[PDB]
Amino acid sequence: VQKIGILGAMREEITPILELFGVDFEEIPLGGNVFHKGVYHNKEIIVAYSKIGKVHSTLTTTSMILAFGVQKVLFSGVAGSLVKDLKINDLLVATQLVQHDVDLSAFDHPLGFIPESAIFIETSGSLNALAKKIANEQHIALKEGVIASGDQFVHSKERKEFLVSEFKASAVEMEGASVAFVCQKFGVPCCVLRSISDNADEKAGMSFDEFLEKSAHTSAKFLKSMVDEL
Amino acid sequence: VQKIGILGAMREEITPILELFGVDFEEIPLGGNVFHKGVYHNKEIIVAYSKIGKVHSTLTTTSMILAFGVQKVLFSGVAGSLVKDLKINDLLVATQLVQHDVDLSAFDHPLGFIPESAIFIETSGSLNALAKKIANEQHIALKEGVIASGDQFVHSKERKEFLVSEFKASAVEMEGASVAFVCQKFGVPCCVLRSISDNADEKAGMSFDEFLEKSAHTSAKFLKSMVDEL
Numbered sequence: 001v002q003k004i005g006i007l008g009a010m011r012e013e014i015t016p017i018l019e020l021f022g023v024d025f026e027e028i029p030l031g032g033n034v035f036h037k038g039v040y041h042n043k044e045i046i047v048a049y050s051k052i053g054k055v056h057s058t059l060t061t062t063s064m065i066l067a068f069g070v071q072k073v074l075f076s077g078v079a080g081s082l083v084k085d086l087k088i089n090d091l092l093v094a095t096q097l098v099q100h101d102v103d104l105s106a107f108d109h110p111l112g113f114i115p116e117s118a119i120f121i122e123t124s125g126s127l128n129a130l131a132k133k134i135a136n137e138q139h140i141a142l143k144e145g146v147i148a149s150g151d152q153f154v155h156s157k158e159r160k161e162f163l164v165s166e167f168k169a170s171a172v173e174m175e176g177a178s179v180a181f182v183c184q185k186f187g188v189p190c191c192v193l194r195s196i197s198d199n200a201d202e203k204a205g206m207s208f209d210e211f212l213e214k215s216a217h218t219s220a221k222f223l224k225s226m227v228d229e230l
Numbered sequence: 231v232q233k234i235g236i237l238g239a240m241r242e243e244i245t246p247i248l249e250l251f252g253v254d255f256e257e258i259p260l261g262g263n264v265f266h267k268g269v270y271h272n273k274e275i276i277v278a279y280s281k282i283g284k285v286h287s288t289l290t291t292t293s294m295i296l297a298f299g300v301q302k303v304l305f306s307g308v309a310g311s312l313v314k315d316l317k318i319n320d321l322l323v324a325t326q327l328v329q330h331d332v333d334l335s336a337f338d339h340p341l342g343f344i345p346e347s348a349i350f351i352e353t354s355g356s357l358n359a360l361a362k363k364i365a366n367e368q369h370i371a372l373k374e375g376v377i378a379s380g381d382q383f384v385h386s387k388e389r390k391e392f393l394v395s396e397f398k399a400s401a402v403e404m405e406g407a408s409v410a411f412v413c414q415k416f417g418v419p420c421c422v423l424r425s426i427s428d429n430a431d432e433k434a435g436m437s438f439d440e441f442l443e444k445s446a447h448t449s450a451k452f453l454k455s456m457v458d459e460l
């Protein structure tokens with residue numbers, strides 16, 4: 001009855017999701033994505049990886065909503081940490097997201113702002129509160145904070161400093177803001193969950209390669225614990 | 231019978247389109263866009279402005295296809311010129327588009343490239359050939375070339391030089407690549423038509439403010455001449 005959309009960006013982010021749910025899935029191709037449709041604890045779950053970045057994730061989220069009719073979207077994957085207290089493997093949920101690479105400052109718009117929109121996009125307070133409740137019960141740390149999304153893999157101190165000073169972001173990735181944006185437009189509750197894979201600095205490529213699979217699994221496990229309480 | 235989606239990014243880009251078609255439209259809100267649905271020369275035309283940038287335009291294009299079932303998408307609006315022979319008011323059609331702000335070079339991917347995708351996205355050769363035919367018959371210049379799209383308003387010589395050297399782009403805007411990308415994914419013919427509003431340099435904000443309305447109208451008139459032959 002209840003339909004839940006579950007998104008990662010990369011195949012690596014959804015492999016553990018499919019395995020952890022442990023049910024059979026039907027594969028349904030649409031718009032260049034493969035949607036895995038299954039039934040788990042009396043809910044219909046629709047799982048897909050968008051492919052990397054803002055256009056990919058916007059498209060996939062829109063398809064989930066318009067073609068599959070999902071009633072909530074939960075994103076699970078990895079991210080770069082912009083703050084000392086978010087270390088490799090640590091989880092956070094996005095309270096707000098921003099498109100950090102948006103620049104219409106030639107017209108004196110604030111960075112991140114587009115006319116007829118807003119700098120910050122909100123996620124579901126109800127889903128974030130559920131995550132927090134579960135994290136406390138499992139004795140797991142969970143941070144809440146701003147996630148910055150853009151179409152670059154960030155791997156420099158200079159870009160980190162900008163994201164922190166301009167947007168007070170705690171983490172960086174390439175999809176969350178676009179997912180939450182679409183959801184907002186269609187009145188669909190959204191939760192963006194990430195596990196830290198790297199520190200978004202000069203060493204980030206190397207850290208990401210090392211920790212992608214473990215961090216993806218950490219995020220996937222937690223997302224499943226949320227779906228278990230929905 | 232035939233359904234044609236018509237897109238601009240800004241309200242200013244579709245105002246002349248609605249006026250030039252000169253028919254009644256029904257307004258249908260969806261996903262934060264207003265779709266203007268009318269009948270013109272025995273075709274159903276669905277007109278909308280996406281709002282600025284790649285996420286907005288991806289969403290709107292996806293809605294056009296999935297919710298309204300359009301069989302072709304024609305984009306009309308303004309752009310920054312990256313080449314001397316494209317002057318203010320001049321028209322071009324995009325042969326290919328690129329997301330110029332995509333950077334996964336930390337993993338030695340070429341700029342503009344995302345895994346499971348491609349740097350360049352093609353548009354409809356058939357629609358481009360129609361534009362060329364019409365332009366020749368009307369004795370209007372029409373260039374064909376690469377259009378670069380990103381989420382920044384480009385207003386610097388340094389960024390222009392990069393777009394020309396890296397992608398051999400002739401023009402820059404913030405929506406075309408995302409529109410053509412979605413269309414490709416759903417097998418929908420796409421044509422991206424632009425009229426030059428500025429030179430994407432330090433003076434671009436000022437040129438854009440001056441020429442937006444005239445350049446939008448130039449593009450809109452031409453798009454209508456295409457729809458007249460479809």
Ligand SMILES: CSC[C@H]1CN(Cc2c[nH]c3c(N)ncnc23)C[C@@H]1O
Binds near residue numbers: 010051200
């Ligand atoms: C192969 S591209 C990176 C993929 C992993 N996703 C999140 C991410 C982790 N670290 C990041 C960083 N330093 N900068 C931006 N994004 C991220 C984004 C994209 O799907």
Ligand SMILES: CSC[C@H]1CN(Cc2c[nH]c3c(N)ncnc23)C[C@@H]1O
Binds near residue numbers: 104281383405
């Ligand atoms: C208010 S933002 C600019 C709007 C006009 N569209 C095209 C465009 C013209 N000149 C451009 C330039 N120098 N750099 C990028 N884009 C453009 C993009 C956006 O909708």
